[PDB]
Amino acid sequence: LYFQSMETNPIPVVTVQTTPFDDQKPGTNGLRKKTTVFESKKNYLQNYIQSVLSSIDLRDRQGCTMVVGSDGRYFSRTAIEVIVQMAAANGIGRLVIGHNGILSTPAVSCIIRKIKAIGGIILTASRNPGGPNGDFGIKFNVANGGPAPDTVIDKIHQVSRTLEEYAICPDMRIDLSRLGRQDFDLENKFKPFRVEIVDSVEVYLNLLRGIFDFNAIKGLLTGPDQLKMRVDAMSGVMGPYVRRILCDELGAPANSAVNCVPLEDFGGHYPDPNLTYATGLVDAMKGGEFGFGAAFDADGDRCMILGQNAFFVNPSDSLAVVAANLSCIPYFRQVGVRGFARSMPTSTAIDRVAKAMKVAVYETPAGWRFFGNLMDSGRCSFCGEESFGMGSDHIREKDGLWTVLVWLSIMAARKQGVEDIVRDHWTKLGRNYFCRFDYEAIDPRAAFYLMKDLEAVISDKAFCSQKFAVGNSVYSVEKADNFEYIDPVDGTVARNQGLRIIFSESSRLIFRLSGTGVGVGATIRIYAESFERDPERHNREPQVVLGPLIAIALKISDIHERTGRRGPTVIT
Ligand SMILES: O=P(O)(O)O[C@H]1O[C@H](CO)[C@@H](O)[C@H](O)[C@H]1O
Ligand SMILES: [Ca+2]
Ligand code: NA
Ligand code: NA
Ligand code: NA
Ligand code: NA
Ligand code: NA
Ligand code: NI
């Protein structure tokens, strides 16, 4: 098929010889390194961008569209520039980029799916700190808008470890500050290379408007009896989303929007929503003047929900509560509820809802990528993780602001505050007490032998006959395993996904090695769960209830001696 056209000042395409790197395999949620690795290690960033681009069939990449966005952290604008120069050189037809480089992770997923893009690159290190001395990360999402599957992660890795050259258009300059279209004539490309700078919020907001009853939510946030609300974006990507959606569209006063200017260092604070790091929000909620509080992580897919007086909504309870109240949402009234999913370490509170509702519930490895197949196949429409994550099949990522809007929708439909809804839920279904200990940046050698030895302990043929006593508490082993998951849709097998001990007395211990590290150090997470049926025992301190289970965990793992630590780095 023949065509003729004109070109003006075509941008040359440069081929650069390079040496492969050894460690360019992404973890659970992207390739995460210290920022200085991407910024200063020669060709480190270019090698990985080329490897990502090369995991796309050359015929499927010619004339395709990719979405690019960042959480705003230091080095994002430089990475975006390089990404645009390299996408142009590798024959990508069009890039859709958020205004000023800003696109939340839920917005990227939404836009990929909406415009049928082949995929997306999200520049974020999630809850990790930003700045020149901070962390930087590169996520790759595929055509369903969800994280890259193990199939694609391996293709990226084998391209990165053997890469010998990459292509780039170094003379290209892109203005992220102006909305609209920018076309570029490239040498040896017939069609112009197209860049669209899009409003960070508009298309994502349009999706949310069809899921939720915005009139109902607006009624809750306005008028004389209005909900008093504090929403902390932690100086990350969610700033403009909060202001445009919760304030402008839904009527919340401007003082509801806290830390809603994106900053390259997130204001010098960890953009991590929990009681340990969202101290500014907790302190304001403790004052008693607000009925609802929320904090988001850097890229807007995590959310902590607080009630009046900083009542803490455990993320595993958030999952169960919302699951039991999906009828309050227009979306789920129309399309129904096909199934639930949680990660294996997440508490089994949602399983009790699924049983009562006669709905399937799946148990996946940690990480949102495993919910993608469940949603695509229609097996599941609502899912969550203990790590402050919740989402639905509206996209293929977790979604913090969606979590806020579904909670407000439930509060409006039930005419109840946060704490009353949760306690009413506990009264109906019982309470699953739950906590997580993080042992951060421990020696990888120590972690290896710890997990190896513990696996041998819990896999011994006599372990299911064991029982443990701490004080007056007794726990009897029902089952134990090294969790594996065979994807029911595409057959991907994920092994070594957590050491799990299930006790007969409605209790669990889970041990996992982290897969989202940046540097050398390893992180071990211990999860403890205990179910309480008695409604008079639903106001105890979780660290008291779970004390004995934690004692057993620390003893059989020997973690304190093996790591030199006296206790966990973080408690959730
Ligand atoms: O470091 P980990 O435990 O492998 O992974 C952690 O971050 C992931 C990416 O946000 C979450 O999906 C997990 O639930 C969380 O535990
Ligand atoms: Ca037993
Ligand atoms: Na040209
Ligand atoms: Na700083
Ligand atoms: Na079902
Ligand atoms: Na109430
Ligand atoms: Na993480
Ligand atoms: Ni995140």
Q: What does the DSSP 8-state code read for residue 25?
A: -
Q: Is the CB of 497 under 6 A from ligand 1?
A: no
Cα separation of 473 and 478, whole Å? 16
458: left (phi over 0), alpha (psi -120 to 50) or beta: alpha
- In sequence order, which residues have a C-beta less than 8 Å from that of residue 461 and are 6 or more positions away? none
CA distance 97 to 451: 42
Q: Where are the domains of the chain?
A: 1-200, 201-310, 311-430, 431-572
Ligand 3 midpoint to CA 65 (Å): 18
CA distance 238 to 102: 9
Three-state DSSP state, 288:
coil
The pair of three-digit structure tokens given for residue 170, joined into one six-digit string: 């170094």
Extract the tokens encoding 280: 């500014």
Burial tier of 330 (Cβ tally within 10 Å: 0-12, 13-18, 19+): middle
Distance in angstroms between the alpha carbons of the first and the last residue of the chain: 61
- Decide: 77 and 177 in contact? Cβ < 8 Å: no
| Closest by CA position to 91, among listed 43, 144, 53 | 53
Measured from the CA of 368, which atom of ligand 1 is nearest?
12
Cα 321–Cα 327–Cα 329 angle in degrees, nearest 5: 95
313: CB partners within 8 A, 6+ apart: 304, 305, 306, 307, 321, 418, 422
Nearest residue by C-alpha to atom 15 in ligand 1: 387
Query: Cα of 125 to ligand 8 centre, how many Å?
Result: 8
Phi-psi region of 564 (alpha: psi -120 to 50; beta: other; left: phi over 0): left
Listed in order, strand segments (DSSP E) in 46-104 are 65-70, 94-102
Helices 105-115 and 400-414 sit at what angle, rounded to 10 degrees? 90
The resolution in Å comes to 2.0
| Contact between residue 196 and residue 93 where contact means Cβ atoms under 8 Å apart | no
Report the distance separating Cα 364 and Cα 146, nearest Å.
Answer: 15
Tell me which residues are annotated as active site.
126
Please name which of 371, 400, 386 lies closest in space to residue 299, comparing C-alpha atoms: 400
Atom of ligand 1 nearest to the CA of 525: 3
Alpha carbons within 13 A on the beta-carbon side of 321: 29
Beta strands in 3-86 (DSSP E): 14-17, 31-34, 65-70
Q: Which of 324, 356, 533, 314 is nearest to 431 (CA)?
A: 533
Sign of the C-alpha dihedral computed for residues 278, 280, 281 and 284 taken in this order: positive
Kindly state if the Cβ of 366 falls inside 6 Å of ligand 1: yes
CB distance 126 to ligand 1 below 6 Å: yes
Distance CA 513, CA 151 (A): 21
Dist. CA 383–CA 303, nearest whole Å: 14
Q: Are 404 and 322 in contact (CB under 8 A)?
A: no
CB 366 within 8 A of CB 385: yes
- The residues pairing with 70 across neighbouring beta strands, listed in sequence order, are 102, 123
* Distance from residue 145's CA to the centre of ligand 5 (Å): 23
d(CA 525, CA 500): 12
